[PDB]
């Protein structure tokens, strides 16, 4: 059968809307290969990604969280631009070169099979489930204790991926999205097909949530 990941329960008053975001610096080797190949090291997603420090965070990240910026005209240099309004983050970022971690919970609107689809420039990792993304109600502490990727998308050669999970309406599923841009254009597209649906959506409104971190499977 299809994969059936593990989820979490919580009283509605311990639940709030949307994901948490952390933004981390990702420098060029030099500013006018110019780009840093570090993002390719296997230890980068687990510990290396924090080594240039962070620069911002947000909460309640909900709705239309994908983007495709291919309008930039210059490579090998930092370009300032804004995230979608879904991110509740007002400052411009070095959209040319940065790392982001989005985490929290995905709650399906009905029981059944969900297909996710990702498209990356440069790099997207997808962890999903309480035995794959992070522990129920213990997100801060366990965020980098993720398991083998549910999907691994990397530009140019493996930039498109998909994956299928059978989900239950009553459950909040730990979800962890890792994104990196090494240089220039940036694509973070994460979409899904709910059950019996042939048309993809990139709008997560009503699917994304955060449970309080009380260490006890809630």
Ligand X SMILES: CC(=O)N[C@@H]1[C@@H](O[C@@H]2O[C@H](CO)[C@H](O)[C@H](O)[C@H]2O)[C@H](O)[C@@H](CO)O[C@H]1O
Contact footprint for Ca ion (CB under 5 A): 22, 57, 121-122, 181, 183-185
22 labelled as ligand-binding? yes
Binding-site size for ligand X (CB under 6 A) equals: 12
Looking at residues 27 to 56 of the shown chain, list those that interact with ligand X (rule: CB under 6 A): 33-35
Binding partner selected for residue 35 from Ca ion, Cl ion, ligand X, none, CB under the kind-specific 5 to 8 Å limit: ligand X
Strand, helix or coil for residue 139: helix
Residue 41 DSSP class = S
DSSP strand E in 30-72: where?
54-61, 67-69
160 labelled as ligand-binding? no
The rounded Cα 80 to chain-centroid distance in angstroms is 21
Looking at residues 169 to 208 of the shown chain, list those that interact with Cl ion (rule: CB under 5 A): none
Least distance (Å) from Cl ion to the CB of residue 64? Answer: 26
Q: At a CB cut-off of 8 Å and minimum separation 6, what does 140 contact?
A: 213
Site string for ligand X, 69-88 (x = CB under 6 A): ------xx------------
Interface segment toward Cl ion; rule CB under 5 A; list 27-35, 72-80, 125-133, 195-203: 125-133
Binding partner selected for residue 75 from ligand X, Ca ion, Cl ion, none, CB under the kind-specific 5 to 8 Å limit: ligand X
144 labelled as ligand-binding? no
The rounded Cα 72 to chain-centroid distance in angstroms is 23
Looking at residues 164 to 203 of the shown chain, list those that interact with ligand X (rule: CB under 6 A): 182-185
Cα end-to-end distance, the chain, whole Å? 29
Peptide bond into 157 cis (omega under 30): no
- Which run of H or of E encompasses 161? strand 160-167
C-beta closer to Cl ion: residue 83 or 150:
150
Residue 77: other Cβ atoms inside 10 A: 16
What is each CA distance from 160 to 154, 185, 186, in whole angstroms?
8, 16, 14
The rounded Cα 162 to chain-centroid distance in angstroms is 14
Binding partner selected for residue 5 from Cl ion, Ca ion, ligand X, none, CB under the kind-specific 5 to 8 Å limit: Cl ion
183 labelled as ligand-binding? yes
> Does position 121 bind ligand X by CB under 6 A?
yes
Least distance (Å) from Cl ion to the CB of residue 26? Answer: 29
User: Up-side HSE of residue 218: CA atoms within 13 Å toward CB?
Assistant: 23
Task: Point out the annotated binding site for Ca(2+).
Answer: 20, 22, 121-122, 181, 183, 185
Q: Which residues bind Cl ion (CB under 5 A)?
A: 5-6, 129, 131-132
């Amino acid at each position: 059968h299809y994969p059936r990941p593990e989820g979490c329960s919580s009283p509605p008053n311990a639940v709030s809307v949307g994901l948490h975001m952390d933004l981390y610096n990702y420098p060029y080797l030099y500013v006018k290969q110019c780009w840093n190949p570090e993002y390719q090291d296997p230890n980068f997603p687990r510990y290396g990604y924090k080594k240039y420090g962070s620069f911002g965070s947000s909460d309640h990240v909900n709705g239309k969280i994908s983007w495709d910026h291919n309008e930039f005209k210059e490579g090998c240099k930092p370009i300032m631009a804004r995230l979608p309004t879904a991110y509740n983050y007002p400052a411009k970022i070095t959209f040319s070169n940065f790392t982001m971690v989005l985490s929290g919970y995905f709650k399906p609107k009905s029981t059944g099979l969900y297909k996710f689809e990702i498209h990356a420039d440069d790099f997207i990792l997808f962890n999903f489930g309480s035995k794959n993304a992070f522990e129920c109600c213990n997100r801060e502490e366990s965020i980098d204790n993720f398991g083998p990727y549910v999907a691994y998308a990397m530009w140019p050669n493996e930039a498109d991926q998909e994956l299928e999970v059978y989900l239950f309406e009553d459950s909040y599923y730990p979800i962890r999205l890792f994104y990196n841009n090494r240089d220039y254009h940036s694509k973070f597209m994460v979409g899904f097909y709910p059950p019996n649906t042939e048309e993809i959506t990139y709008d997560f409104d009503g699917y994304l949530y955060m449970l309080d971190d009380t260490g006890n499977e809630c």
